[PDB]
């Protein structure tokens, strides 16, 4: 059975949903070199995403590695509201928001911690986050990477990199890449299997 459609909220574009979610811009100070995970490289939209994945994000990490039980949901939350979705094949649970209704069926959704826009069929297994996790800042910060080969940068997704922050306007970054607990690396391997899944682009996240 499909999830019930959202009862409320304002539908938004991919650019707008990124603007509406909470983001910790203080983690990327200008004129400094910082260590961050290359969350995603969108070679169709040019821009990349960086995530601090700092000790303050520990609750999100616990949900992602299925270390915390969550209440399964049958009613999609409102557009712009934050919840969790299960990638059943790769066994990880990630934070998500529905930004709009799709004309052909389903919805447009944003993976706030990965910086990825995906189609949401409405058959996906979804959960309610506890309020503290729900209120945590989105890990993925939009970043214009300069002086580098973006295509080559795509292979370094889900790895720690060092970036020189040229500009931090408070919604996006202009950064140049420069050429960490054991649990953090283990989590990145778990994320990479979901990200590298051969059918993720075609089917999105699979149910059950």
Author numbering: 287 to 465, 483 to 511
From the primary publication:
Amplification of piRNA in the ping-pong cycle requires assembly of a tertiary complex scaffolded by Krimper, which simultaneously binds the N-terminal regions of Aub and Ago3. To promote generation of new piRNA, Krimper uses its two Tudor domains to bind Aub and Ago3 in opposite modification and piRNA-loading states. In addition to its self-interacting N-terminal region, Krimper contains two extended Tudor domains: eTud1(272-512) and eTud2 (562-746). Overall, our results reveal that the two Tudor domains of Krimper have distinct architectures that are responsible for the differential binding of two PIWI proteins.
In the 2.1 Å eTud1 apo structure, crystals belong to the P212121 space group with two monomers in the asymmetric unit. The overall structure is similar to eTud2 apart from the C-terminal region (484-511aa) that forms a long α-helical fold that inserts into the narrow interface between the Tudor and SN-like subdomains. We named this novel C-terminal helical topology the “latch helix”. The latch helix is stabilized through formation of extensive hydrogen bondings and salt bridge interactions with its amphipathic concave binding site within eTud1. Furthermore, eTud1 possesses a ‘latch helix’ that must move out of the cleft to allow Ago3 binding providing a potential regulatory mechanism. First, the N-terminus of eTud1 contains a long-loop (spanning amino acids 272-300) connecting and interacting with both the Tudor and the SN-like subdomains. Pro292 within this N-terminal loop forms a CH-π interaction with Tyr365, Glu297 in the loop region forms a hydrogen bonding with the backbone of Ser387, Arg300 in the loop forms a hydrogen bond and salt bridge interactions with Asp394, while Tyr304 in the loop forms cation-π interaction with Arg428 in the SN-like domain. All these intramolecular interactions help to stabilize the overall structure of eTud1. Although the overall topology of eTud1 is similar to other extended Tudor domains, eTud1 has its own unique folding and recognition characteristics. The unusual binding preference of eTud1 is reflected in its non-canonical binding pocket, which lacks three of the four conserved aromatic residues.
